[PDB]
Amino acid sequence: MSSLLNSLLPEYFKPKTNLNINSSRVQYGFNARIDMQYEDDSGTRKGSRPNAFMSNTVAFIGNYEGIIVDDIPILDGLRADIFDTHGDLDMGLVEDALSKSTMIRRNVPTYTAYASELLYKRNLTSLFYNMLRLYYIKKWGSIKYEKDAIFYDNGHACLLNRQLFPKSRDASLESSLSLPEAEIAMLDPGLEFPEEDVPAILWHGRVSSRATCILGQACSEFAPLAPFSIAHYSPQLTRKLFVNAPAGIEPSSGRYTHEDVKDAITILVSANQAYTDFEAAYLMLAQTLVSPVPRTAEASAWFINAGMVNMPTLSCANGYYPALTNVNPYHRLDTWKDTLNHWVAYPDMLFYHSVAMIESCYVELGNVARVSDSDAINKYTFTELSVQGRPVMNRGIIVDLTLVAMRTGREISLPYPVSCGLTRTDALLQGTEIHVPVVVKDIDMPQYYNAIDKDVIEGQETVIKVKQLPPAMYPIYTYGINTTEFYSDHFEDQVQVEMAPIDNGKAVFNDARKFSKFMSIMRMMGNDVTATDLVTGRKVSNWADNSSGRFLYTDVKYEGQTAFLVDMDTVKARDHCWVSIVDPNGTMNLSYKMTNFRAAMFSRNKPLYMTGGSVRTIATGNYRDAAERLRAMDETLRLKPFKITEKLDFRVAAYAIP
Amino acid sequence: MSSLLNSLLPEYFKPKTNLNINSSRVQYGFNARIDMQYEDDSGTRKGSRPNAFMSNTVAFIGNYEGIIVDDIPILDGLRADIFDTHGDLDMGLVEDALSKSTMIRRNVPTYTAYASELLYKRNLTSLFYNMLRLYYIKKWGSIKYEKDAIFYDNGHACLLNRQLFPKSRDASLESSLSLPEAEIAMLDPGLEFPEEDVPAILWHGRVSSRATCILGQACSEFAPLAPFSIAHYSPQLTRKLFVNAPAGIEPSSGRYTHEDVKDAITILVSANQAYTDFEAAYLMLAQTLVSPVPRTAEASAWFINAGMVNMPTLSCANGYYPALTNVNPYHRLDTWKDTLNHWVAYPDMLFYHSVAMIESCYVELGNVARVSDSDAINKYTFTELSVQGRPVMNRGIIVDLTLVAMRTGREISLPYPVSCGLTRTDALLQGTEIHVPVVVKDIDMPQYYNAIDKDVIEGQETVIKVKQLPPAMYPIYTYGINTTEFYSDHFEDQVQVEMAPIDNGKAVFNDARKFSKFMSIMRMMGNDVTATDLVTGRKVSNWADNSSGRFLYTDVKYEGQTAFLVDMDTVKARDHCWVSIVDPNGTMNLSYKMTNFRAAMFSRNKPLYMTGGSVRTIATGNYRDAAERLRAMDETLRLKPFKITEKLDFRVAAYAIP
């Protein structure tokens, strides 16, 4: 769904057609200008940060596994006459439709019996999913995965790719997969009984020598060596695949270019009228394509256990009964060919749509994790209250699109309630502390991180405990579309806090909200302050994340209640503007303004520049030549948003109906 | 009748087409949120179970035996001209109709004489019944039956499959039956005198190679090895079967799929004009598709002796008189094709219609068994007063439909008073003791159950004496639509047990009604209560079921005087998500509230999900409006043009609609 994911990008940013990705890691952000103004009891001070880079990091590494499941049928592309006055498939009219379009009327009773059983299981989403993955393996087939490389690196702790991904070796993306080929047989017209558990698809003219090899490899098993996002393990779709081609198919060549895969997809969709089936596969890949690099070491807990990708079962009966597919197809929405027309024009735009989607999900799960398990809307019952359709199960895409609705605060709508794709909320839905394996870089590691072994040596491999899941990403593209108090991602804001009395060289902050505001100010001024949690006896630091220049309360790494002892004597000066002061006095007022946003992308510690021309808009209106909006709002999936209502605690988040 | 069985299903239940059954046991039910409360002089203790599963276990096994009986003729199908004003065959118009036809002139006088006997032989219910069973045998053929498997187990008593079903070998449903084929001869139109005691049917065009194999096996003896419900014992319907098909009958293929049986049925109903015959066969199979696993150990008395199935004799004389069947048939009700049209569209919906019917019957036979013989509407005379027709004998479908009418509280209407199918009320009307076999687990069994021995070592085969039949199923689909105080299936309920501090926990229940509600609500709260009768000296436990989680008064297994001593310092916490009664003092007040309902099904201790399209309420009007429409768009290939439009680039072309 192009028009949906295209809306998530910020109004100032309009990306160009091509993007030459040449690495397994891409930073994306913006260069903003901050105009700070400070006032306290001592006096006033005015400064200005001329260039500030706020960015996340996203990679092409994510452990996933495929399962074949049975899902709903997509009834789009079938002729409009077989459907009655309502949006329902009548078997009374299928008998009539097949009868009028043949001379041999002996086969009508047999044809109707088989058609009735097959039409209620038609889904080509799994075939297009694999065909799309083959396109990007050939295009970006020079990305290197080194086993003894770094995953996260702060200075105290470190995670290697040996950990998080065991049973892996060093390989390029083209060298990862060695796909076998399934038998692409020809369906001779005259066969009366459709062979069971084998799909048949239509084709335009002669099946090319290259087109055979693509369809053969798309249906086969995926068995990777290196952990890659677009080369994840998938079960075998089918053994055989019939093709009702008037001209006979040619034998498989063995080799194909990425350009040849586009020609295979464009023909397969046009012949079968499977435009809505492609839209499902497009959204399903947008989830998987890229995975987040964690903000802090604790945010690696999300990516330990392998998330399951629900691939629908491959079934189709267009090859057997080509009478059912004619020139007047049935569609629910009039904008039902937009997603394919967008991809075929601008293939590399999927990267930006993928980054936009996975950001929105992992940002909002930062809030859902902090919700107490004694309210109406909680981690267990947030999807069920949101959805207003009838899917098979609240899994895959339904979970992800619910989180996008909660982020943007708008009603998202799909034509069919499809439940296919990655489920992320697995690490969240379990009342157990997660054991992230880490490497010790400095001797003073146990003071900061909640480590098992309290005495360590540089080189030792230990384990750290994570109870509450912290935010994996900060808002960048979705910055200021709706501002929560937790992130505090405002354009303009006036922070007011009262400074605690400095007894010896230490200031006690008993309250939780005041402590968050204090360290948030001192960070924007650019003062590396270090405080001691009195309950646990572990040191917290506002400079936890360098990439995103902000302080979240989850950097304390202790759910519950505590009091902090801030060290006011050892306040280091890392980055100093003219605003920056060391000695606060009385009531601290900081008023900042953010202006002059401009998007910038970094890859392999150099600037990554966009190539090609400017993207012209392709989009169809609500009506072509349709008079009355026959609402048909019974079967269509609808996802209602939730607004965060702030309360006194500040540690707990709460959702309400707007 | 699809219509009346559809209304039995709950409002929240939204069924889909396909149901992938892969076992011989299904736990259908619903998930509800129970808000329990315990109020006392000391204070209130609140609990909340967010997902409480109330289930009824249903199996695919059950001993049945078919017998060929004489039943009324179904006159729906014959041309409307030969019928008089009253609605009976006016012989004289038959002789007129045969004379003005395409019949051989020398046969008219001899055939007209036979008409008086042969035209009143119209009942195809037996053939359609067997052909429906062949459809489901080949569809769900992979289900297994093990000999030494657990039929029932409640911890104390165990009942194996060897006990109830001797002469039983372990085998799959597909490998159970080995059906021999009956002769399908071609009717010679130039036959001198019609052969009575040999049925002759009509057919459209040519009898296919597979249709011969299906009709051959349908009119044959069912001799099963494993006691399956859809493969029970049936006698040989007929030896030979004539088929008036001018196009010759092809010889038997040998093999056929489940889709080929649907092809055979749709041709047979259409040619013979026998839709009311199919409606009778649909309701027959709805009774005897699935049998309920007994709720308690002593509720196995219903399934000891084999209940007889009444199959009406196969008799059809359409082959001899082709002229009398045409396109203008005589029918009583206008909605006479609705039952077939429903089955062809949604075959797997019969499973839901079957469980709805047996749950309605076995619930009502529960509270019919607890009435004294000295009454107006009693055990023996509940069918006679309800029935306002003229059936041959009050058996089969009449007894099952009258029980459904009592449950729902509505008027059930059928077009013909047909008396065919299973008779359930067999063990009830006998009014004698039934001896169910049991294998013991513990050594302290015969205190609880009314056993034949008083001391029994573990692993011994004993006998339980059941006098009054307890309810076999708890109401789940019919929950709080026609509520009785016996089952106590309310949304809101409360009980007030009155105790004084002078009593050291010990309470005596003089009343029987509130004893039942106390013991039931304590089990929702997850507390194992063990009462002891003061008069007799037996013991009862509220934990006497692992499906519904309720206490019915028939679990006492004795009718006498009510003096139940419950000691409230021996209450043990058994389940999870439970409220604790540590030490009560004064008057106790228990209460619960069920708020929302969500349909759930379980199989092999895993969730069984419904897949496929959205099932609609098919009406007679929804198809014949498309017949009124006719697709009246004159079938004329009108090709509309597209004017090319030039813009800035001129290299690429752009087409407009006008």
Added chain:
Amino acid sequence: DLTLVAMRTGREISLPYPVSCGLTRTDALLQGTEIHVPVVVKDIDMPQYYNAIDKDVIEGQETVIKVKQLPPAMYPIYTYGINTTEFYSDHFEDQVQVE
């Protein structure tokens, strides 16, 4: 073929029965791949003009031309200036100003 004629003339074509028989022309178009047409050369300076497979070819050699986009096979003559487009430029009056 009838729907292409309807686009050219700009009128509504009506047949009594929706019959689907005859030649199908749109075959090489829908494939959307490169086609390899054979050619015998006359001059030696051929492969500058045509997108040939070889860069130097002696006269009388059998070579191959790579055709990607299909050029028009016929120019409009009978349908000249009835439904005019700017691509063909089949006007009665036309002018161009080179500055």
Added chain:
Amino acid sequence: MAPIDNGKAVFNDARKFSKFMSIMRMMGNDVTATDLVTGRKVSNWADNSS
């Protein structure tokens, strides 16, 4: 208190800490608080008269 906290409560306010510790003693409960800054301990049972 929230369920995420495993029984442990921090009293930032001094006024309601006094009322909590006092009412718990009427109810006959021996509470022993520990100061986070200094590291001393206080017990509500510090009298046998009032």
Added chain:
Amino acid sequence: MAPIDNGKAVFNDARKFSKFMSIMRMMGNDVTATDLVTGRKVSNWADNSSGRFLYTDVKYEGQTAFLVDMDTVKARDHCWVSIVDPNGTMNLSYKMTNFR
């Protein structure tokens, strides 16, 4: 801005080419383009004294098309305004004050 195919942007028009190199000079980016007709390299940094670009620095009267090298854009003088990668329609609004 012309579409950057490989690492090269074709400027067919004469006026648009003059405005492009005039912007990139004020930002302070030493851009080098190749005249396709003559086959000689033009540079916007021709005169250091006067900080502006005239069209006569091409040194070819007549009509031509320029192939601008977008990969080899050096950074001689950088203010905070200065960017290397232009995208779509470029707008530059400057004000000159405080002459001495």
